Amino acid sequence: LYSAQFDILLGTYCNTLNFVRFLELGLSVACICTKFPELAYVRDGVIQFEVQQPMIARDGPHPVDQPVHNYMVKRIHKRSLSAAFAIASEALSLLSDSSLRIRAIQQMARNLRTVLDSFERGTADQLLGVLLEKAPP
C-alpha cells in the first residue's frame, strides 16, 4: 500500500482482548477442581457413601427401633471438550523476511492463546450446564 510518513501513534495503543480467568469467577467456589492428568485413560470410577441414621429411643406400644446404616454408590459420569485451529500453508512455509517471521510468530501465538483461553472459559460453561440439568425447581 502507498507509503507515507506513517509515524507510530507515539503513545496511542490498542489491546486485542480481555482474558478470562476461572478462579476469578465467583462460581469457582461451587466446584472443587483437582488435577488428574491420567483422566483420558481411566476406565470407571465410583465414590463411597457410608451414613449412620440417628435413632432416639421411644418407650411405649411401638416396635423396637434398631440402629441401621445406609450405603450409597455413584457413577463417574464424564464428558469431553474439543476445539479447532487452522494454519495456512504460507505461514508454516515462513516458519519452516525476518519481519514476516516476527509478525507470524505473533499471529500463531494470538490464535493459540485464543484457543486455550476458550477451552478454559468453556469449562465454566460446562459446569453451569450440568448444575442446571441437576437442579429441580
Partner 1 sequence: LSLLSPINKFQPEGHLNRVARAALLSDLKRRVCADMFFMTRHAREPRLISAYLSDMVSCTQPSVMVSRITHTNTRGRQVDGVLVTTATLKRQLLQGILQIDDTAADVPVTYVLNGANLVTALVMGKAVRSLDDVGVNARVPADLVIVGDKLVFLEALERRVYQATRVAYPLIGNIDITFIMPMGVFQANSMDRYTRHAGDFSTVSEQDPRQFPPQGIFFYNKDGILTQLTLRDAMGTICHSSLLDVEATLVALRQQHLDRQCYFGVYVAEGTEDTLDVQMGRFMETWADMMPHHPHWVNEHLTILQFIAPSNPRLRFELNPAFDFFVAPGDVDLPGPQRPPEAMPTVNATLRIINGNIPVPL
Partner 2 sequence: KFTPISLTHQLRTGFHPGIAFTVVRQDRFATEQLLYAERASESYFVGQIQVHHHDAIGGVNFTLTQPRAHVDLGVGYTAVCATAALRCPLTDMGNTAQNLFFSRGGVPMLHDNVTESLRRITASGGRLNPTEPLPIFGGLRPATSAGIARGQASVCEFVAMPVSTDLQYFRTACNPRGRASGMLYMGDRDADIEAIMFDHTQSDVAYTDRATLNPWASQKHSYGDRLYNGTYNLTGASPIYSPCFKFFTPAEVNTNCNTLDRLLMEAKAVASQSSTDTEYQFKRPPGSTEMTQDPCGLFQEAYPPLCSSDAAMLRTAHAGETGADEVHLAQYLIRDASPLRGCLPL
CB 105 within 8 A of CB 74: no
Cell numbers placing 7: 509515524
Residue 129 binds partner 1 (CB under 8 A): yes
Are the C-beta atoms of 88 and 108 separated by less than 8 Å? no
Of partner 2, a copy of itself, partner 1, none, which one does residue 72 interact with (CB within 5 to 8 Å by kind)? partner 2
Q: Which residue has the cell 437442579?
A: 135
* Three-class DSSP category at 69: strand
15, interface contact from partner 1, a copy of itself, partner 2, none, CB < 5-8 Å by kind? partner 1
State the binding string over 68-87 for a copy of itself (x if CB under 8 A, else -).
Answer: -----------xxxxxxxx-
Nearer to partner 2, 23 or 86 (CB): 86
Estimate to the nearest angstrom the gap between the alpha carbon of 77 and the chain centroid: 16
CB nearer to a copy of itself: pick between 11 and 137: 11
